[PDB]
A paper describes a structure:
Prions, the causative agent of TSEs, are composed of polymeric fibrillar assemblies of misfolded host-encoded cellular prion protein (PrPC) that propagate by fiber elongation and fission. Biologically distinct prion strains can, however, be serially propagated in identical hosts expressing the same PrPC and produce different disease phenotypes. Rungs of the fibrils are composed of single [name] monomers that fold to create distinct N-terminal and C-terminal lobes with the N-linked glycans and glycosylphosphatidylinositol (GPI) anchor projecting from the C-terminal lobe. In this study, we determined the near-atomic resolution cryo-EM structure of infectious, ex vivo mouse prion fibrils from the [name] prion strain and compared this with the RML fibril structure.
[name] prion rods were purified to ~99% purity with respect to total protein from the brain of terminally infected C57Bl/6 mice. Mass spectrometry analyses (provided in a Source Data file) showed that PK N-terminally truncates [name] monomers in [name] rods at the same site as in RML rods, leaving [name] subunits predominantly starting at residue 89 and extending to the C-terminus with intact GPI anchor. We determined a 2.6-Å-resolution structure of the single [name] protofilament and found that the fold of its constituent [name] subunit closely resembles that of the RML protofilament, including the double-hairpin N-terminal lobe and a single-hairpin DS C-terminal lobe, with four additional C-terminal residues stabilized as part of the amyloid core in the [name] fibril (94–229) compared to the RML fibril (94–225). Akin to the previously reported RML protofilaments, the [name] protofilaments comprise a helical PIRIBS ribbon, where each two-lobed rib or rung is formed by a single [name] chain. The left-handed twist of the [name] fibril is slightly slower than that of the RML fibril (approximately −0.54° versus −0.64° per rung, respectively), which results in a longer crossover distance (approximately 1,585 Å versus 1,344 Å, respectively). In each strain, the N180 glycan stems from the base of the C-terminal lobe and occupies the groove between the two lobes, which is significantly narrower and deeper in the [name] fibril than that in the RML fibril (approximately 52 × 41.6 Å versus 67.3 × 34.4 Å, respectively). Considering the protein backbone, the widest dimension of the [name] rung is shorter than that of RML (96 Å versus 107.5 Å, respectively) and falls between the first (T94) and the last (R229) residue of the amyloid core (one residue away from the GPI anchor), whereas that of RML falls between the first residue of the amyloid core (also T94) and N196 (the second glycosylation site). The tip of the first hairpin contains the Ala/Gly-rich sequence (A112–G130), which adopts a modestly different conformation in the two strains and is hereafter designated the conformationally variable (CV) region.
Numbering used by the authors:
A (entry chain C), B (entry chain A), C (entry chain B): 94 to 229
The structure:
Amino acid sequence: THNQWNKPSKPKTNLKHVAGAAAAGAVVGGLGGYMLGSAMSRPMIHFGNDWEDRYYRENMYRYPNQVYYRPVDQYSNQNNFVHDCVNITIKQHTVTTTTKGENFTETDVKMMERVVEQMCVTQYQKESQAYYDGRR
Amino acid sequence: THNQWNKPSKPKTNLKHVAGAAAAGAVVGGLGGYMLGSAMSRPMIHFGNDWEDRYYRENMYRYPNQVYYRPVDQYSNQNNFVHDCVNITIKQHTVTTTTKGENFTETDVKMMERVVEQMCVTQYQKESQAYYDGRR
Amino acid sequence: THNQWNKPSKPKTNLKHVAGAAAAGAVVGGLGGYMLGSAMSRPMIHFGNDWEDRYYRENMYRYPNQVYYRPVDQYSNQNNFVHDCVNITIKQHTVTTTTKGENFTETDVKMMERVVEQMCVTQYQKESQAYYDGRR
């Protein structure tokens, strides 16, 4: 004989942003031949009555990851790598408040001239040769 | 004999952004021959009576990942890589408030001249030769 | 003998953005021969009574992923890569408020001249030869 009763009264339940999996990653340049990991979300969430018996689950798992990097004659040049440039700013900022004023003069002057040439990420490369043969 | 009763009273239940799987990734340049991971979202959520018995599930799992990178003659040039450039800004900003004023003069003046040449991501490359043979 | 009763009272239930799978990925340049991961969303959400017995599911799973990168004579040039450029802005901004004013003068003056040449993503490449043979 097996009995299960579930009588919750006004069970307000919220599940926001639960069990999310995300496999990602940023790669700039490099010589390849690499492996990025996987993402697994496997939660068991239970409310109420759970009854289990005489089962056999989730056995004999294997996760063999192999990276075999065997180049023979590899010639490479890697120059001027950057990931990202964020929140570069130049500003002239004024905040003026006057709750109550009489017979007053306010003047705001903002000058910008020849402020900048480059703000970020200026990349220059002239002569790159992975293999150069200039004998004699 | 088996019995399952489920009598919740006003069970307000909310599930938002649950069990999402996202496989992604950004790659700039590189020499290839790589593997990015997968995303698995596998949650079990139960609100009530759960009864299981004499079952056999989720066995004999294998996840073999091989990256085999064997180039023989590889000549490569990689120059001037960037992922992204975000939130670059130049601004002249004024905020003026006058709740109550009499016989007043306000002046806002803004001049911008020759401010910038390149705000970001300027890439220049002149001479690249993966293999160069200039004998004699 | 088996019995299952499900008599919830006013069960307000909401499922929003549940069990979404998204396989994506951005690649700029590179030498190919890669593999991007997959997305699997496989949730089990149950309200009420669940009764399982003498079952056999989800066994003998294999996920063989192989990347085999074996070029022989690979010559390549990669120059001036960028993924994206976002939120580049130049602005002159003024916010003036006068809840109650009498006999006042307000002036807003904004000039822009020669402000910028390029905002972002300026790419220049002159001479690229994967294989160059200039013997004698």
